[PDB]
């Protein structure tokens, strides 16, 4: 198909915030403004020092970029959380973020991984030579179990760039290949564990809400990025591997039939996580729920996936999809539009120097 | 579900062996014995050293079973890789293996895991002591990007079986649960990585389709192993979470509908197999196959399985699938029916004492 699907994306939107029981909180402007900065602040200090500057290979409005939307992602999402496990999540989800830009071959760097590992040597990759130093900010926050999970997570990320770099979308044929790579790239364990820091949560008493939400969480997130990002990928000609287009290669079908999955994968994710959790502790309900609904307010704001233009071009449409779409959307803005001058300040670059 | 399914089981286990397509090898019996003694000789030395004797919580006949399980199922699977990579595999395997006895919570354990890991401090847990100290030995036959997957797969593992302590089969509606237990614990990116020894492949050269064969075979070879099992579980109220009953109890179906699932994804994933690799390079293809014949051969074989009950039960019915079967079986018995006096020897308490 060469015209974007606009109906059809439109009323799986709608059914998506629906299901997750899209609506107001009391998280309000002013709050996410106040945790906006400080989450961008700390974490502009650190990709501003001198070894984070030498290391981390990262054009620096590329880097600017990156971490806005990562700092809104994470202050928007893990509203629960407080304003210090805030900055130090965006500062190792603007790592995972940034280490997609690096085309450099992995494997001469990884050829003595596990020996340097094993004896405490600084890895040979400076990624992981960053990552592994700043980990211990990010892992304070949370008990031995959540922990295992980022860790772990982090390291199929590291192992999912690794295979994003051959561009490929897998054998025609070869089915449990997209999921397969949405997962090691998805930071599904990284995102569901780092919901629950034992300052709020005790990890062995909700050990089974906690894993049944990793579990749940991790697809629910990937696949809801992926609808979300439909939009702005379905012209670049850039974007040339995705779960979408690898349904496309690996099973044969079209990108029609793609999306198709992939929406009714969304829904019915959403459907059984309110299922769930809806009559569990209630403050695992409530952080899972305002996870759900900052992630896509979120993705609603942030410029980067243009979904203000879906808005423009329908805000005058009588159909009932079209006007749902448009009221959650002008929610969204009402909390989450907010310019970047209010928070993010002053840039990376500018404290790099001085 | 009282009655075995055996006529169903029956005619799953030929399809299954069909697609696959199941066939005589040039890998003779004696071969097979001289690899089996040589793979049990260098294990059983190495768990029975003080040090591995000291940390290794096992009880002495269950270690001996589970060394003689594993060594068989290396041998008989990964056919082409050399005597000592069989023998280092068997270690890691039944530490593996093992790690399913411990009934000891890991969260005191687990407390400094990543402190001390950055440290190259020795892990609190003996296990991860054992394991890691051992590491090098199997990751000295493979290339970066497989011993990376070989890591990660036994991370997992370790947290597969953390969450299994809590023998917890899954929230009523959690339909993401069951896979996700059975990837964390299934070692499948271990197995599937672990096919590919850098002295007979090229990982640069072959990356593709080695990632897309520890993609598929992940799958593969834990559904086998659950249908094969599906037997000696299906009355053992000991065995009380698996795939198939974490099916019935999170997606809430029957235990027919649960094992039909099984049954469909585990013979499409055979059919994908072949389709797949058939026409790839033939080293990768003939290493795909043989350790599918392999693991199909050591299923029916060992004794834990108890499959040689359904064989006497049907070796004279003329139905078409318990004959199709019986053969298979004998053609099994005939190359891997070997009786463990043959190759299996000192047992590892003899070698501990001296």
């Given at each position: 198909m060469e015209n974007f699907p606009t109906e059809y994306f439109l009323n799986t939107t709608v059914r998506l915030l629906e299901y997750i029981r899209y609506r107001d909180s009391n998280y309000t402007r002013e709050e996410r403004i106040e945790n906006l900065h400080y989450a961008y602040n700390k974490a502009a200090h650190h990709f501003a020092q001198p070894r984070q500057q030498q290391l981390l290979k990262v054009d620096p409005k590329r880097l600017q970029a990156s971490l806005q939307t990562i700092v809104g992602m994470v202050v928007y999402s893990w509203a629960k959380v407080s304003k210090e496990c805030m900055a130090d999540l965006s500062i190792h989800y603007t790592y995972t973020l940034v280490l997609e830009d690096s085309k450099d071959d992995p494997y001469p760097t990884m050829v003595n991984y596990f020996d340097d590992l094993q004896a405490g040597r600084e890895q040979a990759h400076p990624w992981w030579a960053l990552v592994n130093e700043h980990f211990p900010n990010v892992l304070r926050h949370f008990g031995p179990f959540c922990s295992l999970n980022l860790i772990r997570s982090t390291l199929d990320f590291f192992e999912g760039c690794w295979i994003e770099q051959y561009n490929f979308g897998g054998?025609?044929?070869?089915?449990?290949y997209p999921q397969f790579l949405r997962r090691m790239n998805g930071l599904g364990h990284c995102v569901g564990a780092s919901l629950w820091p034992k300052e709020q949560f005790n990890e062995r008493s909700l050990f089974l809400e906690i894993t049944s939400a990793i579990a749940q969480m991790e697809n629910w997130m990937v696949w809801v990025n992926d609808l979300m990002s439909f939009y702005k990928e379905?012209?670049?000609?850039?974007?040339?591997?995705?779960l979408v287009k690898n349904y496309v290669v690996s099973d044969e079908i079209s990108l029609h039939e793609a999306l198709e999955k992939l929406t009714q994968d969304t829904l019915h994710s959403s459907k059984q996580m309110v299922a769930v959790f809806?009559?569990?502790d209630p403050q695992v309900m409530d952080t899972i729920e305002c996870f759900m609904h900052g992630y896509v307010t979120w993705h609603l704001c942030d410029?980067?996936?243009?979904?203000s233009e879906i808005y423009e071009k329908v805000?005058?449409?009588?159909?009932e999809d079209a006007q749902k779409f448009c009221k959650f959307y002008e929610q969204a803005a009402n909390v989450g539009a907010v310019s970047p001058s209010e928070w993010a300040y002053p840039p990376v670059a500018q404290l790099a120097n001085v």
């Open positions: 054998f025609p044929g070869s089915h449990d379905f012209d670049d000609e850039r974007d040339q591997i995705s809806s009559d569990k410029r980067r996936y243009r979904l805000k005058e449409e009588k159909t």
